Structure 1
Amino acid sequence: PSYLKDDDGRSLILRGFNTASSAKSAPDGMPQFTEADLAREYADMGTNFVRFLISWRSVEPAPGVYDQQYLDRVEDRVGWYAERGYKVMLDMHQDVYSGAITPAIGNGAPAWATYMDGLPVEPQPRWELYYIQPGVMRAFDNFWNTTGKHPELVEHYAKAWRAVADRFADNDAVVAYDLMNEPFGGSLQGPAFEAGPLAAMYQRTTDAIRQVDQDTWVCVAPQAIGVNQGLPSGLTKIDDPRAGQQRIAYCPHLYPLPLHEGLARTLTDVTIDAWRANTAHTARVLGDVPIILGEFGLDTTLPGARDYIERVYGTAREMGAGVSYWSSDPGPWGPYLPDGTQTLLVDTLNKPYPRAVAGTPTEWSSTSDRLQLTIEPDAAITAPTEIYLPEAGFPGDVHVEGADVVGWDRQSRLLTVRTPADSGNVTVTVTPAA
């Protein structure tokens, strides 16, 4: 596997949340999420990544006019993450195109960009079913210019991304731009969509972003319907005009149809197998790119939930993939119920992991009181390997074999170690002091 790298050249293992669905409907475009909430997340789980929801409606409230005050608010939030050592992926999020699909249900595009052409959008028993209503299908068909009537929409979209990238190009905490949440092709589905207008939009948007930001990873998703459930993607390679090596990453989601016992469990397990094979294939097509699992999640109160969650994280680890769990929002899917009570997720996610490795991590494992990591060395890297250790399992000092301890910060929970680069692959083993 391939990895995103920090400015020190260290390979990043990214663990965090989507933050947050509450931003979708907020007049000011911000999530119901405070700096204190982030402090809690970090204290409880030691996360180092966020998929932070932004929106086209908030960036470009009128055609060609970008809201710099909205971008100020996003920058403020990114600052909270920066202060606690997080890396940020900005997600241009939509579901069912826009809030403008009914006089609420959807989110994303501004009203001026929403052309349903008077076609109906009748109430449906599940939010996902709004995708196939005539007005929503038309809204997307117009956006992709399948209708031939709105070539301007993708152009506006690309330049709205350019505006965001112009603001965040020199932001040390931002590592990735996730160009579109769950692309939906309307009347176009499969390879016709993904290799056609979807790829074309990604290319135009990448090109626009690269007018103002040369180093942030541009993250592209397959179409969500089908691919979320373990079907292959027909997405094609996107060219990165930046000088030097490509910085494109692949950011699919994982949502098995059964969702965890009986035949449902078997179906979900083979879904993971299928999803892994397809994800690896498309990551190769795109240029042997890094993978970020941009969303997965479920109601943690379902029997078998922990086993599913642990299997997904094991699979991500084996694939060298980042993970942003859906989502930090209050409720049984998330780490906290509305009153602040921890769900099963906190203890499940709160495990040691390498955050930033001085070399390629070839394999690693962890339990509550042990971490082992093997590193393919890189003599050019001078920064130490940086590792999270939860206080539950590591209440005092550390015992490290295979590396020299550089620092052990018992407050931030960050262990830093140093390994040789001229001795082949190095295995580091971390256990609690006796």
Structure 2
Amino acid sequence: PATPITTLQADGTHLVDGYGRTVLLHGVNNVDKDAPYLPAGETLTPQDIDILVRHGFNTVRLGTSFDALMPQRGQIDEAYLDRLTGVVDALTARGMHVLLDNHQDGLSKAWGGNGFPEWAIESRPREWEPNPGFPLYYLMPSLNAGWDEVWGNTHGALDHLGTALGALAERVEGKPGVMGIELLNEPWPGSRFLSCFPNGCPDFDRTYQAAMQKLTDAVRAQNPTIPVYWEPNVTWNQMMPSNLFAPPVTPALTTADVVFAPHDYCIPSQLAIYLGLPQALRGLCVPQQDLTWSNIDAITERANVPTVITEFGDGDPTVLKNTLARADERFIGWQYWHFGAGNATDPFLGEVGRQLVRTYPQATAGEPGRMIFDADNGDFAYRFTPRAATRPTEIFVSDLHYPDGYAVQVDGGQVTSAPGARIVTVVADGSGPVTVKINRPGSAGAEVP
């Protein structure tokens, strides 16, 4: 008997559900980059979705795009919206919070990327300019002039984008399982990107924040309560800090329900994958990703908004811990890149899934305290401070880590779920802190950090 899915609302740095519980989201990215978009038979199957439910994921970052939404100048593709809604509904029916991502890579199909429709951008690459594809194409001069058109709104691309996202916002209005709209994936600053190095770009981020505010206002004009997800400009991925929400340099955040949506990639891992550079360079992943997390902490203290890591991993099992442990430390949720449709086999049964599939509190009737999960043996410990809520604390128990079943101990509360249950439910004894341990029956278990 599943808990009905509800809207999520930003309360300071937490996301809270309709029952008053603090929610932790773990899930995946599912993005269709190529037209035709979401064609019949090539979207997530009932089987794919069962895999996500089986492994306890409660969120999907679902790709949409400007091109898919408005494939001709000023004309919304309503048939595409029907197909997109079909996928959203299939996911939310099974307890998945769906984040709608206005995806792009390398601006447009004109550069061999995706996102913006060709009709909306004047710039084109010449036959002579080398195109190394992802991610180096961001250094192509024509692609840069493309982004200049966007940030300058030179030919009304932002105006049209606002209309497109407004139409999307309107179509999903009233669906509680839609967790928000992410306004733009990996925004490139265009021709003045070098001003972001070596320590960020205040002036561009002012331009960028104004553009995101405009898109937010367009969304909220059609759907006044839907959360909006704002990424840092993508020089973030080359260790450069964000200057979002930093008065007096950039405006204070005056819009409600805004969530910070950074990515957490290891540079040497990405360069190994896309350039074929030595994998052994991943020795530097830890200090570099620590810097990203330090940057996230800065936004958190400054803006007091929630954060979701909307992309990480990209198939590399060695870097996952860097995101997972630091995310657990701050009680921050995440979406793994990437989970494709039409799986003939379960892709979470190897090295990646052993770390992604975890025992974790999906919803806490209280303020989260410290948490730990040992991805080798399944040891789990969690402490929180109870608050009044209309549902109990729900903890998903990994289907991979406990072959001989699992044991549960609670201090300051009771387990109300059945032995061997997929979800552990905990009710607090009173106002005092609650401590939960879950582990293999023969394990001594973990302590709360």
TM-score w.r.t. the length of structure 1 is: 0.85
The answer as to whether partners of 2:379 and 2:438 remain within 8 angstroms in 1 is: yes
Residue 355 to residue 179, structure 1, CA distance change in 2 (3 Å)? same
Alignment-derived partner of residue 129 in structure 2:
122
The answer as to whether partners of 2:141 and 2:191 remain within 8 angstroms in 1 is: no
The answer as to whether partners of 1:356 and 1:387 remain within 8 angstroms in 2 is: yes
The answer as to whether partners of 1:361 and 1:375 remain within 8 angstroms in 2 is: yes
Residue 194 to residue 218, structure 1, CA distance change in 2 (3 Å)? farther
Is 1:149 matched up with 2:166? no
Alignment-derived partner of residue 352 in structure 1:
359
C-alpha distance in 1 between matches for 2:410 and 2:128: 62
Which runs of structure 2 are paired with 1:191-210 in the superposition (5 Å)? 191-192=201-202, 194-210=204-220
The answer as to whether partners of 1:369 and 1:394 remain within 8 angstroms in 2 is: no
Alignment-derived partner of residue 240 in structure 2:
231
Residue 149 (structure 1) shift: 3.0
C-alpha distance in 1 between matches for 2:285 and 2:188: 23
1:267-288 CA-to-partner distances (Å, cap 9, x unmatched) read: 2111121111111112333x21
C-alpha distance in 2 between matches for 1:219 and 1:121: 38
Identical-pair percentage: 29
Amino acid at match of 1:360: E
Q: How many residues align?
A: 407
Structure 1 residues 8-17 or 338-347, which shifts more?
A: 338-347
Give 2:299's match in structure 1, choosing from 273, 277, 282. Answer: 282
Is 1:317 matched up with 2:321? no
Alignment-derived partner of residue 4 in structure 2:
none
Residue 106 (structure 1) shift: 0.7
Which runs of structure 2 are paired with 1:376-395 in the superposition (5 Å)? 376-379=385-388, 381-392=389-400, 393=402
Amino acid at match of 1:2: T
Residue 111 to residue 386, structure 1, CA distance change in 2 (3 Å)? same
SS of equivalent residue, structure 1 residue 187: helix
Residue 235 (structure 1) shift: 2.2
Is 1:327 matched up with 2:327? no
Residue 309 to residue 118, structure 1, CA distance change in 2 (3 Å)? closer
Which runs of structure 2 are paired with 1:6-85 in the superposition (5 Å)? 6-20=17-31, 23-29=32-38, 32-43=43-54, 45-85=55-95
Residue 38 (structure 1) shift: 1.7
Amino acid at match of 2:408: H
Point out where structure 1 has 5 or more consecutive residues left out of the alignment.
none
1:370-417 CA-to-partner distances (Å, cap 9, x unmatched) read: 4322112222x2211111012341755753313223334967x22222
Residue 3 (structure 1) shift: 1.8
Amino acid at match of 1:25: D
Alignment-derived partner of residue 267 in structure 1:
284
Alignment-derived partner of residue 292 in structure 1:
308
C-alpha distance in 1 between matches for 2:14 and 2:78: 32
Tell me how large the CA RMSD over aligned residues is.
2.8
Residue 198 (structure 1) shift: 1.3
C-alpha distance in 1 between matches for 2:66 and 2:226: 19
Residue 51 to residue 422, structure 1, CA distance change in 2 (3 Å)? same
Give 1:181's match in structure 2, choosing from 185, 192, 211. Answer: 185
Amino acid at match of 1:157: L
Amino acid at match of 1:422: S
Alignment-derived partner of residue 166 in structure 1:
170
Alignment-derived partner of residue 5 in structure 1:
16
Amino acid at match of 1:18: N
Is 1:107 matched up with 2:111? no
1:296-354 CA-to-partner distances (Å, cap 9, x unmatched) read: 11443xxxx34x212320111112211111111389xxxx7x86564421222222011
C-alpha distance in 1 between matches for 2:137 and 2:79: 32
Give 2:415's match in structure 1, choosing from 405, 422, 429. Answer: 405
TM-score w.r.t. the length of structure 2 is: 0.82
